[PDB]
Design a protein around this nucleic acid. Structure first.
Lengths: 74, 62, 204, 121
RNA sequence: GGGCUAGGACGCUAAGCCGCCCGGUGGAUGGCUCGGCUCGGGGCGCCGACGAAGGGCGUGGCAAGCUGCGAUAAGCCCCGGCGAGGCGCAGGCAGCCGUCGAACCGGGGAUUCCCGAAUGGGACCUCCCGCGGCUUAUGCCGCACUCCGGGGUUUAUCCCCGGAGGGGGAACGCGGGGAAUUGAAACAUCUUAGUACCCGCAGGAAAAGAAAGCAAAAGCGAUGCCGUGAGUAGGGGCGACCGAAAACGGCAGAGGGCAAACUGAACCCCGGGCCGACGAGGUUCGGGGGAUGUGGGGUUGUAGGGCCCCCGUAUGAGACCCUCGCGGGUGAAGCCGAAGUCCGCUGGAACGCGGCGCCGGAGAGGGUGAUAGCCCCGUAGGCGUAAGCCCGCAGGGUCUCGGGGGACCCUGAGUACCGUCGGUUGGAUAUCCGGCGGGAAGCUGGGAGGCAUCGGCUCCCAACCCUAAAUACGUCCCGAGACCGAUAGCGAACUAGUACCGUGAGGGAAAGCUGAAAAGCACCCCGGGAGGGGGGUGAAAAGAGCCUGAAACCGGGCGGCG
RNA sequence: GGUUGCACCGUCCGUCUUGAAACACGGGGCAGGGAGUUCGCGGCCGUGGCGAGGUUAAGGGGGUUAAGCCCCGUAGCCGCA
RNA sequence: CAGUUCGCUCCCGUGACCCCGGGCUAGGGGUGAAAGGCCAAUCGAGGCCGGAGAUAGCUGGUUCCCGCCGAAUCAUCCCG
RNA sequence: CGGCCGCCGAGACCCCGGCGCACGGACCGAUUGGUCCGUGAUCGGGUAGGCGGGCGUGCCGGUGGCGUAGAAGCCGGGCCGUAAGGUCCGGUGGAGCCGCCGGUAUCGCGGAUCCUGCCGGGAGUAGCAGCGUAGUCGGGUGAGAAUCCCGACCGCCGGAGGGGCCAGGGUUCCACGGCAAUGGUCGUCAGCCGUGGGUUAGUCGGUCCUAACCCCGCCCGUAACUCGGCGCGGGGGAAAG
């Protein structure tokens, strides 16, 4: 319905095409590392994250139930 | 070897590669007794590979 | 494609780009979109979208909506049907019509009802299409006209598939496509007494 | 609602590619109306031993004997459907059997004769 | 206007600039599409020492390629099918063949070089050789690598008869060997990943498969596969990531054989005959295999397994296999199949327009001089047969069962399990598999229920074997398209895996369009002229890579400037 | 409308860049080809059905030339503390 | 002329010499009177194919128009 | 330098008319959108970026049109649109093609030392010279002769610019007929093009032997092999021994 090219345009001929400086569009570096990468990083990477409460801390602590011990109730 | 390529090249004169008894391509190296293409002399089998080479001609043929 | 064309890099030191060609000829390669013979950029995949859900509740309401449009005069003239039997929107006829399954017999009856005139419209050609794509198929074909709903005599009438632009159905197979193709409802219908009764029972 | 090739390209392939024998069914031509009713045979595969009238093209109502029927070209040569050739001779004008109607037959062969009479009508 | 002087004049301004027009060049654009691509439905679902796949060389009237064949050489023969022209792509010239029925299509048969797993030995696609059969000789026919099975004999292990193996295959499948770039913004564990790549091997499907299972403890009674569980449990610098199953709903459905107990040659293979429709089956006669055990019984669970009894008690009744007449359907891809080629008009030609008229259990799609329901292939409908397949109808042959009484049958070994090192996995103490060391039990027993051990409780029998079907693929056929359309789509619409490159492994293009008909340029003028110009076609910006015929750019001309 | 004379103003284009007429980088000219795409998952938005529930997936019946749509399956997911 | 050539000059020129044909050794390997030289116009680790569309915070490019609003080039943290 | 007066001199500011935006009011529609009026002095530059409306391309469906009395396409002109782009005429061309509405994408090109294809300037320039610097007159032939042939005359070469051969090439050999192309220029010549033809072996060599060395079976290794070294047994290895 919006033609992406219609916005991209041949239009905007921004050519940057909603990316900014030409240098920016590239590899993993813009992203800050792949994926979830950088959450863990002590070092600057992503710390804070595109999570609202930011990132919650790492060490899932606490233990597991066997599935069997869980009666379901309703 | 490097440059002076004209000065060098009097061999090739001697041949080490032919029309093969098995495949018919240009690789039955008379010296080894091995066909580079087909693998005749070396193997009972035809040379064929994942990359391939042999396969590619065959698909191309299809 | 693009694995049958190997691709090798032609270096620097010669005042051209570092963009790959092929060994021996300097031609078309792979891992290019700028080149002749190169990959297209974002080729069509078999994983491409091909379904759009629409709820069972939603579809039936859509069906209802297209049949209702027929009762209206304004939609009916826009749709292009030209009717000589105006107070009879849509027209219901006695149960005997369904059993007829011969082209000559179903023809005669339409002329007498005044609804043969609509088929005359459907004869006019509306699919010798513009564009090269015609070659592959879907050219030299007719156009749409009345829809006939029956209750019985199988799932189609064996003489009414003949007539131009006429599409046959039963109430146990009726879909939006037949009732209002290209999203243009108000397509005249000719009903069978048992079909109207079974549709009364609207279910889903 | 029909079984069909709705591929025009595939349909072409079948016509060009076809066996020499199957081609006989394409070289058939409609019978002049009286004969067509009488035998009750709509069409029959044309011969050189028959008489024919050329019914479409510049020649219309013109008549002649079929000299050759050539299956690979898909055209036949009729007497009096001619061109004048630039040295000084009158040569046949190839035309398709679809343009043509076979006014009289000729039966001096059993294979042809057996069909026309029996299963065809 | 004449003469004289002076000012300013455009008149013939090279070189050169711009705009248009004409011609040329070039091959864009549109339209054209005997090609692809992906999907779906089926088919194909293997072949080979009875010499394959792959390759080489010949083979045509003229043959350079492609295609096909093989010295009987674009083919030979039979039968059936279509049946009246053909002589592959390939329109030439010439000649030929075919009703004692071609071309063509199907089925079967003949010939099928040399190399090749290439098997007698070696080779640079050739050559040599040891036997034996046979014709007087040349000619010609059969043979000798390596297993198993059986003989022969100086038992030289030396040779003979029988059966096999190897190699290929479009992907898929099963079992082995096994990375790194990368990710973790570094990087070693981790990740990529059991991926890429490599070895062995099988089929048309594989494998798995009738619980030493499962474990909502409740409820189930083979196994694949799909959805889902679930991005869940779980693993992990506990970082990045990694990552099930049980179960459910479905699909398709199928259960069987040994070892042993107890029997112990009752047996199998080979050849010959009789009896029998020369078949199934049964009988007999000569060898070979076989107690280191052929064969009978039996198999999760034990039935007393042995020996007993009591009653139905081989009473009774299938169930399975073979033959042969008949009938039925499928199947040589072949047949049959409705209805305008009417009038007036345009045109080179109507498949157009206008006017009239027609068929339909049937207005799909090509084609034809253009745009055709009614011109031609065809269509809804029904039908055909040799081989081959399936079924019933006449016979022959084979062939089943059920309880309690004592030790219940003994009931699978380097296995189960333990300990030590890996590999791997999600597998956690609680994966799976190997290796190294140790090592059970006699159903009076063993294993399993996600740590160890002991008790209860519930389930189930590993260490022996096989398994249809449902599920993978795209070589091939058909059908399909919100796909592409010749600088695009397959490497490749064609002379393609060609030309060509590279020692080799390997790499690899470009190249589509006459016209109604070839009428493919006669005749006439000119020209050294195979070159080129005028006249000759409905129309030659239709005149020979010939539909259209752009831009860059090049000549000339027009306007303007100069 | 073409072209040209005259008046006036004007140091390409694109990109790099704080600053490009540049003695920064790229381009002979023209034609064609040429770059925000697909799946999964999450967070948003608009719009539509249904309603404390809501939706089917897998599937096979059915219909069709085929197929879509139709009606049937409700496993599971999420919501309802 | 030549992707390593030409002429003059110059070194060796019975030798640890030159040369032909056959044959051997293959990529972290060979070979080296040892220069990181050489192993087929490619060598401080050959070439071919595959992984592979590696990945790069880095250079270049990213194509229709119009209307409306219209920046920051700062801060904290970060093998930054 | 300290005063002063009149003027000149922006797109600013004033002023007429128009246009868009924002907001209010009304109306219109089947959705999006549109129209009419009013208010704005305090609305109108613009890169990154955000949003919003339109345009165009290919194909699909419905709908509704066009075409040999001339489609698309091509070239120049006319008209409309802020514009992206639409539309009409003339020439050319000689079969297909629009509009609307709903969809969809291998959807719009000025750059990428872009990729491919075609083309101009450079140029009628450089090269066609450098090494031991070679031709020339009559005559023959032919459409065309500096470079084809015959004679004469003048030279180079002298272990080679000559003779015989191995490898290697593969018909280049030889005859006849030619010159479009090829030959560092012409060409009647040729190694090109067309068409025919030619390599004959007891006594030459191959073939035999065996070398350095190689392969095969077997034995063995390896997870295994188209892999690997030994030991046996056989077979192969010099067109300059």
């Amino acid at each position: 319905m919006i033609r992406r090219r219609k916005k991209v345009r041949k239009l905007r001929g921004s050519h940057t095409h909603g990316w900014g400086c030409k240098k920016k569009h590239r590899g993993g570096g813009s992203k800050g590392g792949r994926g979830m990468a950088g959450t863990g990083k002590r070092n600057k990477s992503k710390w804070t994250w595109t999570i609202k409460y930011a990132p919650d801390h790492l060490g899932k602590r606490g233990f597991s139930r066997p599935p069997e011990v869980q009666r379901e109730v309703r | 070897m490097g440059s002076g390529t004209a000065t060098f090249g009097k061999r090739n004169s001697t041949p080490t590669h032919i029309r093969c008894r098995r495949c018919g391509r240009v690789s039955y190296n008379v010296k080894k007794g091995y066909c580079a293409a087909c693998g005749f002399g070396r193997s009972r089998r035809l040379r064929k590979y994942r990359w391939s080479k042999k396969w590619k001609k065959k698909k191309n043929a299809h | 494609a693009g694995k049958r064309r190997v691709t090798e890099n032609i270096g620097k030191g010669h005042s051209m780009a570092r963009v790959e060609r092929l060994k021996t000829p300097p031609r078309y390669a792979a891992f290019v979109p700028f080149a002749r013979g190169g990959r297209r950029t974002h080729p069509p995949k078999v994983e491409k979208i091909i379904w759009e859900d629409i709820n069972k509740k939603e579809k039936r309401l859509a069906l209802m909506s297209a049949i209702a449009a027929t009762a209206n005069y304004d939609l009916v003239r826009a749709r292009g049907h030209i009717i000589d039997n105006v107070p009879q929107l849509p027209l219901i006829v006695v149960d005997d019509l369904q059993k007829v399954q011969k082209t000559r017999e179903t023809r005669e009856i339409f002329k007498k009802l005044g609804i043969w005139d609509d088929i005359v419209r459907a004869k006019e050609k509306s699919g010798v299409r513009a564009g090269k794509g015609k070659m592959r198929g879907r050219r030299y074909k007719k156009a749409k006209g009345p829809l006939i709903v029956v209750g019985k005599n199988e799932g189609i009438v064996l003489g009414a598939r003949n007539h131009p632009g006429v599409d046959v159905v039963v109430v146990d197979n009726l879909g939006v496509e037949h009732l209002a193709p290209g999203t243009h409802p108000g397509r005249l219908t000719v009903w069978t007494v048992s079909a109207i009764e079974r549709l009364r029972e609207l279910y889903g | 609602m029909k079984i069909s090739s709705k591929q025009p390209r595939k349909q072409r392939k079948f016509l060009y590619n076809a066996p020499l024998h199957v081609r006989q069914k394409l070289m058939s031509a409609p019978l002049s109306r009286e004969l067509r009713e009488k035998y009750k045979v709509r069409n029959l595969p044309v011969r050189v031993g028959d008489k024919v009238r050329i019914m479409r093209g510049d020649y219309k109502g013109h008549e002649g004997k079929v000299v050759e029927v050539d299956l690979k070209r898909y055209r036949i040569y009729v007497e009096g459907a001619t061109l004048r050739k630039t040295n000084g001779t009158e040569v046949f004008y190839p035309i398709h059997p679809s343009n043509v109607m076979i006014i009289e037959l000729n039966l001096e062969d059993e294979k042809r004769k057996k069909i026309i009479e029996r299963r065809a009508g």
